[PDB]
Symmetry: D2
Subunit: 261 residues, 4 copies
């Protein structure tokens, strides 16, 4: 079908991109970076994340594929040496697709902005102390005092979530996971401490106590938000689709990245 290729931009990835375009030129494939049906990312997980966010409005019509030119990534799980085999199998098609859940973040003011995350969304203060009330399905759960909070997708659990002590979740589980950044706990201030894993349709709301300015990140993007009244997290109804051509199980991918490869 239609396809496009994004590159990390170093010499290795650009040349690999040109060679795949040349190989694709031998098949019934059209290069189209406006309405592609296949998006190939050549680089690392950062390059893949930019590809995802470049097309996050046509997620239902795109299958993503990542090629890692540096270290193995959790999204870029093809070696450059297999690019020719990848061109061939992609050109025929008849691959099967795999879907991972995504996280929806809603930021309300006094309008409203929504964001989609593949890895996670984090909230920190704009300099001063970070205090928010944590509201779960309209029930006041805790008053969090600390550095910040992180809400992760299942596939994001191997990223910032993991560094904060969160669990690794298999991406077939439609959930999101909330982890704390350096929470203050004494006899007057109390947080749950543990990571919290929320199912689909649960809404986690962050509500300011004093300051209403927050630094909110969504994957690699970080924006300073002002006059915030609420930050809303829930499992998205939208999903990212991967073209898969062989067996590379998530738990094997975790093994290769953190234990040995």
């Amino acid at each position: 079908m239609k396809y496009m290729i994004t590159s990390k931009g170093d010499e290795k990835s650009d040349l690999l991109r040109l060679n795949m375009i040349a190989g694709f030129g031998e098949y019934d494939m059209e290069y189209d970076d406006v309405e592609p049906e296949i998006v190939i990312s050549i680089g690392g997980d950062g390059t893949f994340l930019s590809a995802f966010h470049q097309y996050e409005e046509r997620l239902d019509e795109i299958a993503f594929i990542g090629i890692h030119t540096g270290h193995l990534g959790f999204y870029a799980d093809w070696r450059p040496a297999e690019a020719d085999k990848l061109v061939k199998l992609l050109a025929k098609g008849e691959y099967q697709k795999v879907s991972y859940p995504l996280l929806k973040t809603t930021v309300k003011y006094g309008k409203e902005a929504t964001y989609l995350a593949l890895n996670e969304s984090t909230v920190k203060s704009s300099g001063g102390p970070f205090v928010v009330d944590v509201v779960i399905n309209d029930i006041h759960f805790e008053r969090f005092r600390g550095d910040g909070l992180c809400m992760s997708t299942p596939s994001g659990t191997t990223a910032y979530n993991k560094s904060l002590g969160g669990a690794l979740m298999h991406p077939s589980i439609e959930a999101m996971q909330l982890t704390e950044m350096a929470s203050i706990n004494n006899r007057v201030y109390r947080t749950i401490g543990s990571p919290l894993v929320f199912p689909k349709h649960h809404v986690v709301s962050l509500q300011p106590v004093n300051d209403k300015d927050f630094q909110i990140s969504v994957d690699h993007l970080s924006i300073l938000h002002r006059d915030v009244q609420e930050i809303r997290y829930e499992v998205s109804a939208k999903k990212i689709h991967f073209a898969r051509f062989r067996s590379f199980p998530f738990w094997r991918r975790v093994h290769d990245s953190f234990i040995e490869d």
Copy 2:
């Protein structure tokens, strides 16, 4: 229908049990502790766990209810003062039921024994060092060296799992969670560190490296197993059923138990 009541055995719980039996005597209810359809547990979560394991062969035909005479429990979520209202609403019936997932443990030798857990199943060595190979869906994931491992149900995540750094999972998620006990990590021995959350139909297998004797716990029960060839964990096909009479959300229950009440 038919019902039975188990008591913690202290004076408060026995008297409360006799009063509920007397109140039940005013309705179309029969006391039957062989084939009950309702099992009432009066005490704490330990009393409730014994009730669960007393009838773990009729789980499809029983709705459990817990009354806490001491501190609030995650399973015993009725106060003793509401016992009269509980008798009345139970006698009419037409309550609705809630189901939590359970964990299946299979221990193979050179026969085979299976166990059902409501909270968790743990494995430790019989004195010497604990070393096992961790196999996930037939893929060798890690060689674990440490004190032991804990596999928790969702409702068990607030128990031993929480003390080991595991995430708290909403019990509507059909999953199990594996946490490490004091893992050894240096440049030659490597574990994942993080808790791992597994979906339904994933099989986690523990396989001995040297010693084949292990102390295996299932909820409160702990047995020394000898000549073990494999320990197998998976989400059970069976589920525990709760009679629910009002709204007491899991996250509110977590708040009441760990933040304040």
Copy 3:
């Protein structure tokens, strides 16, 4: 001798300050906020920290005393009701002094700035990724990738250090403690993970890998530093002195603040 009083500035603390000044007026005491020999802090630990940094150039000639008008502080360990008894015992004098160690931070550029910390000094990046090489007594120890690092005094171990998983150290131990903020660990990036406790005369040096701009905090003060070549930590030769009038052991202070009071 000479004395001064700093106030949190709310109504309660200012009035308490005026009453102590009036009570001090009945003794051989002179109010002098240029060269005081006693510095009284009325408020919380933040107020006490500002008092410390106000006079950090006359530390050898000052004994500090803290009165807590809100919650109990680790430095402000007098209740407001005892202020009259505090005035009386201070006026006579013949109290005994207790000294806590301090942390010296040196920031070098391409001049050089030094800072003294009572609680801790932290380093984070100026937006992008934080990567530094950690050098211990000229030996290259690790390449740290994460959110940042925190170096704490013994009395600071109950503050940010504690939130990052650090140990609590009795302040009679002349040491500093380095803790990690969300370190990245995989098969290519490796940090020690554990907190590190360094004795007097050990020098811990942070050296940039790519970016040379860092946000460095010293207690409550946080400054963006540019063109940094090295950040140097060591136990200071200078110490803070407390006037003590009764027994309030550090471990009792820890109990009162985190377990119950």
Copy 4:
């Protein structure tokens, strides 16, 4: 002077031991395993620990040396290839000695037993729940509910202590460090959570609440103690002495063992 050599007992270590004995036969050295002045340990840290405990009554008159035939140890820090150079430099003498602190454990009954630890001493229950009151210098600090507690020397901080989240302490610091094993924390049960570092002359006492039987380990030795009234921890007055022949800094040893070598 007088010397003896202990071996791990595998072929490699025994042969290395015989070759060093033969090399020592060319100098003014006498093999004496009753009153040696030098104790050489050939194996790993377990072999070294047995050598330490074999002679823990002549600690003032012995300098220890460890040769690692397997992986690098924190106590066995000589390679087998340097054994000939080790024999030569040892025979002349005029090496300098380094001392590490040790932990004293006192177990009282209704007589009293004392133990010396090079790594750590741990306390667990004999099957049932572990509950002890933690008393610091006669001040009741906390009621600990969990799996157990671990008190570590500075050089022991890289061992079990590290696996429990404890800090790594440079062994020039005369201290001990207490870490928790899976503590239970909810709104009714409260522990400090953090590791605690105690200076010389502080006494940490564990006192039973219900059960009085405990499994107490001291380094590799683990004994079931019955009718215990108190367990007492303090930095020992005795110290282990190492013969050192070159520079191998503790922090470099930590780097080699956990980061890379």
